[PDB]
Amino acid sequence: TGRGLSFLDLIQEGNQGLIRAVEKFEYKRRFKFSTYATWWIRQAINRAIADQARTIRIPVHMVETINKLSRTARQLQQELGREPTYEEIAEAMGPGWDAKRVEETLKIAQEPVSLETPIGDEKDSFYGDFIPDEHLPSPVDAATQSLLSEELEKALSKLSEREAMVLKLRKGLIDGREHTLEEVGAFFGVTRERIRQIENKALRKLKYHESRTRKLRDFLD
Amino acid sequence: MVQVDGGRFATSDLNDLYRRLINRNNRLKKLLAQGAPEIIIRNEKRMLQEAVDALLDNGRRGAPVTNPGSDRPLRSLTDILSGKQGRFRQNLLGKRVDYSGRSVIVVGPQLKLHQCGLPKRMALELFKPFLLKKMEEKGIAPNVKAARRMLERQRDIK
């Protein structure tokens, strides 16, 4: 108990081990059943603890390594009167273990914390209540993207239809993806060299209009 | 399952309740695949029913399910809806709102009955999109984004 699983979960995993021991017993050896059953029972309980007791599942060999690291740090503190540093643990772990590896192993074994963790003595604040949402764009972000698209269309309308369409097809403002010179050239019916030349002159006219009006600089941050 | 500023993870209790449920369900499916006797399958089904109970309304029947090394009950789906902190009262019949602030009050006896005194630094932020628009209307900034960048720092405000 205490190692991450409920008493009844441990009992059921031990019962699974007991089933295995039944199906693997050999009575000719004259050993009582408990001696052979305890091995598989312990095996099943330990495998269950390794496989289930972590919200972020960690492979069983890595759990073995992390437990070994914990026990090494505990013995080192029992002999040092203080908590060990990364370097002392790396010493006591043997070859292949430096301080950075100990740090990475400790970082990789950090269990998560509950979003419903209480904040304060009154029952009206959760730890999750202070975590801002970073995924969904802000109103400022959406408005700036909208004004950016509108200013880009305002700058592309100052080109001819063909060069504006060439840039829109070459950058993905039409169908998401970016086309190749051969695709845009076969779509407009010119040579890839010609489509590249008109893309160049479109970019040049856009640079000229931008140097004149400066209506797109602030969007570049 | 979010990563906090410190790079560590914080997660909701419903995940641990679902994990309880899924572990017990899978162990039951395996115990049935093999020829497990009556006592074991009965115990497994009882634990599965109580897992569903803890998921839907924890603490409703029996001892409430907690996390290891803590006496705090895990927050189930009934707890999410019910109470002063439930969904209805906390987020649906009343919400935290934008374009809002607060400060200490002070008598103004010179005000007329229909007036109050609002600090400049409050009203700037409270009316900030209006202020960006009006700053663009006048010559104070080229566009809205430049006006916002100008208001970002206090020393850049004229």
Partner: peptide, 14 residues
Amino acid sequence: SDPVRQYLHEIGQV
């Protein structure tokens, strides 16, 4: 009432 008690009772039958 107590599932551990119930299981330990069912186990005491065999």
